[PDB]
Amino acid sequence: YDLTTRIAHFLDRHLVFPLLEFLSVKEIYNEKELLQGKLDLLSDTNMVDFAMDVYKNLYSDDIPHALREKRTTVVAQLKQLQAETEPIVKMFEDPETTRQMQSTRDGRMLFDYLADKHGFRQEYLDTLYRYAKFQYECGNYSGAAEYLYFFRVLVPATDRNALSSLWGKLASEILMQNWDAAMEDLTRLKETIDNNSVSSPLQSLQQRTWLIHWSLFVFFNHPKGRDNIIDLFLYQPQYLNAIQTMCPHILRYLTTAVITNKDVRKRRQVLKDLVKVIQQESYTYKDPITEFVECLYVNFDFDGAQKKLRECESVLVNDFFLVACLEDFIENARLFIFETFCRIHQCISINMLADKLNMTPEEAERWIVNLIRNARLDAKIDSKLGHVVMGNNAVSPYQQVIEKTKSLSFRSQMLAMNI
Amino acid sequence: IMQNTDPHSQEYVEHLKDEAQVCAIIERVQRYLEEKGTTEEICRVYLRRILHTYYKFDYKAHQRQLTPPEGSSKSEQDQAENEGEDSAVLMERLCKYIYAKDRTDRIRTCAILCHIYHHALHSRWYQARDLMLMSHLQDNIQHADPPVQILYNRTMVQLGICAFRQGLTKDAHNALLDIQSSGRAKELLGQGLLLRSLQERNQEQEKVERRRQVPFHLHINLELLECV
Amino acid sequence: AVSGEDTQDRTDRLLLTPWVKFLWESYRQCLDLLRNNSRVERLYHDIAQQAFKFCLQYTRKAEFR
Numbered sequence: 001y002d003l004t005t006r007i008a009h010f011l012d013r014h015l016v017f018p019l020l021e022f023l024s025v026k027e028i029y030n031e032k033e034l035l036q037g038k039l040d041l042l043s044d045t046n047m048v049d050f051a052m053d054v055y056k057n058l059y060s061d062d063i064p065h066a067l068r069e070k071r072t073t074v075v076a077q078l079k080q081l082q083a084e085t086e087p088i089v090k091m092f093e094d095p096e097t098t099r100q101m102q103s104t105r106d107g108r109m110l111f112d113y114l115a116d117k118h119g120f121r122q123e124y125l126d127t128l129y130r131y132a133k134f135q136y137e138c139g140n141y142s143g144a145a146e147y148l149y150f151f152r153v154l155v156p157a158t159d160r161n162a163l164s165s166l167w168g169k170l171a172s173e174i175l176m177q178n179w180d181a182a183m184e185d186l187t188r189l190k191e192t193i194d195n196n197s198v199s200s201p202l203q204s205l206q207q208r209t210w211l212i213h214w215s216l217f218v219f220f221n222h223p224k225g226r227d228n229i230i231d232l233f234l235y236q237p238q239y240l241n242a243i244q245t246m247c248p249h250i251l252r253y254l255t256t257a258v259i260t261n262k263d264v265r266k267r268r269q270v271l272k273d274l275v276k277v278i279q280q281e282s283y284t285y286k287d288p289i290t291e292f293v294e295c296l297y298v299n300f301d302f303d304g305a306q307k308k309l310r311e312c313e314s315v316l317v318n319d320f321f322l323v324a325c326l327e328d329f330i331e332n333a334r335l336f337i338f339e340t341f342c343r344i345h346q347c348i349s350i351n352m353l354a355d356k357l358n359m360t361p362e363e364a365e366r367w368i369v370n371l372i373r374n375a376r377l378d379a380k381i382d383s384k385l386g387h388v389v390m391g392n393n394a395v396s397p398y399q400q401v402i403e404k405t406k407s408l409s410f411r412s413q414m415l416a417m418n419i
Numbered sequence: 420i421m422q423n424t425d426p427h428s429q430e431y432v433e434h435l436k437d438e439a440q441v442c443a444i445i446e447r448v449q450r451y452l453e454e455k456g457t458t459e460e461i462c463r464v465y466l467r468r469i470l471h472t473y474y475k476f477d478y479k480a481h482q483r484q485l486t487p488p489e490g491s492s493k494s495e496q497d498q499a500e501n502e503g504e505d506s507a508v509l510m511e512r513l514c515k516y517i518y519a520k521d522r523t524d525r526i527r528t529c530a531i532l533c534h535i536y537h538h539a540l541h542s543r544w545y546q547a548r549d550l551m552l553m554s555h556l557q558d559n560i561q562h563a564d565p566p567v568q569i570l571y572n573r574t575m576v577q578l579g580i581c582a583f584r585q586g587l588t589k590d591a592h593n594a595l596l597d598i599q600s601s602g603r604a605k606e607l608l609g610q611g612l613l614l615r616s617l618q619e620r621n622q623e624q625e626k627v628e629r630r631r632q633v634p635f636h637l638h639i640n641l642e643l644l645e646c647v
Numbered sequence: 648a649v650s651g652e653d654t655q656d657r658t659d660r661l662l663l664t665p666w667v668k669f670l671w672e673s674y675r676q677c678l679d680l681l682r683n684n685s686r687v688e689r690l691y692h693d694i695a696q697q698a699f700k701f702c703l704q705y706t707r708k709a710e711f712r
Contacts (some may be wrong), residue, residue: 004553008531243549278552281545414437427652427660478650642651 004241005051007201013162014206016041021060022055029285029315035161038246042209043068043173052320060084071139071172076096101137108134109144116151130155132165138170146181153188159197168208176324179219186214186222208239212250218323226257234271236279248287251275252329255293260328263345264336264376271298289315293333302341309355310331339376344388350386361386424569435636443469462514469510473533474637480504480541503539511537518642525563528556532570536577543582551578566631572598572607576644581645589612602642609633667705674698675712 017385022040026033050062066080067088074094081088108131115123128148135145144369151167155161170185193207211232215225229239238245251274258267274280275294283402284291289312296305313330335359342348356363365381368388372379378391420437424430454461483503485493491501502509511534521527531554539547551574560571562625579594596602604612609632613619674697682690702710 002555005555008550008553009519010510011515241553278549282549427656427658429657429661432657478648636650638650643649 001241003201003204007205007242010201012242013202014042015202017044018065021064022395023050023059023065028057028277029318031289032318034317035247038209039213042066042206043213043247044167045175047072047175049321056306056318056320058203066302070094070098071136071168072175073140074138081135091181092159093112101134105141105144106348108135109140112147114407124152128152130253132161136165137308139176142176142390143180145169145172147188149376159195161194163189163192163197163207170210172213174213177219179217183216183220183222186225189317190228194232205240205242205245208233209245211239212247223253223257223323224261226254237274237277237283241279243282246286249282251290252293253323255290255321256325256332259332259336262324264339266373267336288312295344297337297340302337305332306337306341306356309337335371339371342377342379342388345390347382347387350381351386421634421636422632429485433637438471445471454563458514459516460520465510465514466518469507469533469537472504472507473536475540477540493577499581504537507541508538525567528559528563529567531556531625532560532567532574535574538575539581540578544578544585547574547581548578551575565628569607569609573639576639580644580647591647595644604644608638668704670701671709674701 008111020041020042022037023033036046039049043155045065045068047065050065053059054062061080063084066077068302069077078091078094080308082289111123112131129149131144133139134189135148139145149165153162153166155165166185166189170182170189173179173181173185186313190211193210196207211229215222215229216275233239235270237248237251247321254270254274255267258270271294273296278414284295292305292312296308299305310333313333316326316330337354350368353368354361359367365386368379368381371377377390378392379388381388420434421431424434445464448464450463452461480503483501491497493501518527518530531550533548535550538550556571560568575594576598579591581590582591584592598607609628613622615626649659665671674694678691678698682689682694699710702708
C-alpha cells in the first residue's frame with residue numbers, strides 16, 4: 001500500500017512492552033500457540049491466555065510472566081509464585097509503594113467528590129490531572145478508574161494520555177473480566193485511533209492491532225464487529241501492512257462471523273480480497289486449518305476437502321480461547337463445502353457422504369433434505385439407492401433475450417414517435 | 420572498458436578476468452577503515468559492493484546452497500565468503516537510516532529497484548513482489564531520469580519471468596504485457612537504430628544515451644524473454 | 648551463461664569473419680557494375696551460380712540480398 005513505502009524504512013520495530021520473551025519451549029501444536037507471540041507483544045500483557053494453557057497441558061513457564069503485573073491486583077501475582085514453592089524473600093517494594101498510594105489517594109478521592117459536587121471545572125481538571133496521574137499506579141481501585149474516565153476523557157495533554165489510558169483501560173478491564181467497561185472502551189479507543197495524534201508507522205500499525213481485542217473475548221456476542229472492522233478501515237487480512245504481523249484467528253473468526261450470522265452469497269468477496277492478497281500469500285504458506293478451509297474449497301476438491309475439513313474440527317475443539325461460536329463453525333465447515341460440491345454434480349451417495357464425515361446415512365439424508373429445504377441446491381433424492389441427484393443441463397437460452405429485445409424497442413421507439 | 424570491445428569475440432572474455440579484481444579491491448574497504456566507524460558516509464562503498472552481486476544469476480546464487488553445502492571449508496577465514504547472499508539482505512536493511520541523509524530523489528529512490536532483483540533470484544518469487552508492492556515507486560521513477568528507469572523496467576520483467584517459473588500464467592501475462600505493449604525493448608536496453616521507420620528525427624540526444632546504457636554481459640536474453 | 652555463446656564462433660569471429668565478408672563484397676561488386684548482361688558480351692553465368700554455393704559453404708545470410 002501507499003503507507004507501505006513508509007513502513008519499508010522502519011522494518012518491524014514495534015513498541016512492545018514484554019520484549020520478545022514468551023512461554024517458550026512448548027510441547028503441543030504450534031499455530032494455536034503462535035498468537036501469544038504477537039499478542040503478548042503488540043497488545044502488551046495478555047495474562048488470561050497464560051491461565052488458559054495449564055488446563056490442557058501443564059506448565060510452570062506461566063510463572064515468570066505471573067511475577068510482573070500490578071494493575072490486575074498486586075497480590076494475585078504474589079500468590080501464584082508462592083504456590084509454585086518459590087522463595088521470593090525481598091517483596092518489600094510493592095508493600096511500600098502500593099501502601100503509600102492509599103496515602104496519596106485520600107487527597108484525590110477527597111478533591112474528586114468536592115469538584116463533581118460543585119460542578120466546578122477547575123477543581124475537576126486539577127483533580128483529572130492528579131487522578132489521570134494516579135490510575136496507572138494500581139487498578140484494584142477499579143470503581144475509581146471507572147468514575148475518572150466517565151465525566152471527562154479530555155486531560156491536560158488530550159489524545160496522547162487518552163490513547164495510552166483508554167488502551168491501558170481496555171487492557172486491564174478485559175483482565176478484570178469487566179466486559180461492560182471494556183465495551184465502553186470499544187466505543188472510545190476506536191475513535192481515538194481514527195482521530196490520530198501523529199500517524200507514525202511504529203504506532204499506526206500497533207493501533208490497528210488494538211482493534212482486534214475488543215471483539216475477542218465473546219461475553220456478549222461481539223463478533224458482529226466484523227461489519228465494523230470492514231467499514232472503519234479498508235479490507236485487509238491483517239490490518240497491518242507490515243507482513244511480520246500474523247494473527248491466524250482474525251480470519252477464522254471473520255469466516256465464523258460471515259457464515260454463521262449472514263448468507264453465504266456474502267463469502268466470495270472474502271475469497272478474493274482477503275484470501276489471495278499480498279499479506280495472505282505469506283499466510284497461505286503457514287496455517288494448516290484456514291488453508292484447508294478455503295484452498296481445498298475454491299479448488300472444488302471434495303475428497304481431500306471434506307476429509308481435511310473434517311480433520312480441522314479436531315483442532316477446533318482443542319480451542320480454549322473464549323468464543324461462543326466454536327461449534328457453528330464445525331457445523332458450517334460441512335454445510336458450505338457440500339452445497340458447492342453438489343452445485344454442478346450428477347449423483348452423490350448419502351452413504352459415501354456418511355462414511356466420510358462419520359455420521360449415519362439417515363442423519364446425512366435428513367441433512368441433505370434440509371439443505372434442499374433451505375433451497376441452497378435444487379436436487380432430488382434417488383431414495384432406492386440413497387443417492388442424491390442434481391441434473392440441470394438447462395438447454396435453449398435463446399428465449400431470454402427475445403421478449404425484452406423487442407419490448408425495449410417497442411416502448412423506446414415511443415420516445416422519438418412523440419413529437 | 421567493458422562497453423568498448425565486441426562481445427562476440429575472445430577479448431571480451433579476457434576483459435571479464437578483471438571483474439573479480441574490482442571486488443577484491445572494494446571488499447578490502449572493511450577490515451582497514453578509520454573514517455568515523457562505518458556509518459557516516461563511507462557506506463557508499465557497500466552500495467558499490469552490491470552493484471557487483473545484485474544481478475548474479477540463479478546457478479551462481481546456489482553455489483553454496485545446492486552445489487554441495489557441507490563439502491566446503493568452515494573456518495572464520497571461509498565464513499566471510501560463505502555469508503554470500505546474506506550480505507545482500509544485510510546491505511538491504513542496516514544503512515537505510517544513513518542513506519536518508521540525501522534529498523536527491525534521483526539517488527534516494529534507485530536502491531530498492533536493484534534490491535528486489537536480489538530476492539527474485541536468490542530466494543522465492545513472493546519475496547520479490549513483496550518489496551516491489553510495498554514501495555509504489557512507478558510515479559516517482561517517471562519523475563526520475565532514464566538511468567533510474569532502467570532498474571524499474573529491468574526488475575518488473577523479472578516479476579513476470581519468475582511468475583512463469585512458478586507456473587502462474589495470469590500474473591506472468593499481467594507483468595510482461597506492459598513492456599511487450601510496443602517494440603521498445605532494444606531502446607530500453609539503450610541500443611536502438613538511428614533509423615528503422617519514417618519517424619526517427621533526433622540526433623543531438625542519441626550520443627548522450629549511447630554513453631548512459633548497460634554493458635553486454637548484464638543483458639538478459641531477448642529470445643528467452645519472448646518465449647517466456 | 649545467461650547470454651554467452653559457445654566458443655566456436657568466438658574464435659572464428661576473431662580470425663575468419665572479415666574474410667567471408669570480403670568474399671561476399673568481392674562477388675557483390677563485380678556482378679552489378681560490370682559483369683552482368685546490362686551490356687552485350689562476356690558471359691557471367693559461370694560466376695553467378697557460385698554465390699549460392701558460398702551461402703551453403705560459409706554463411707546463409709547473404710542469400711536474401
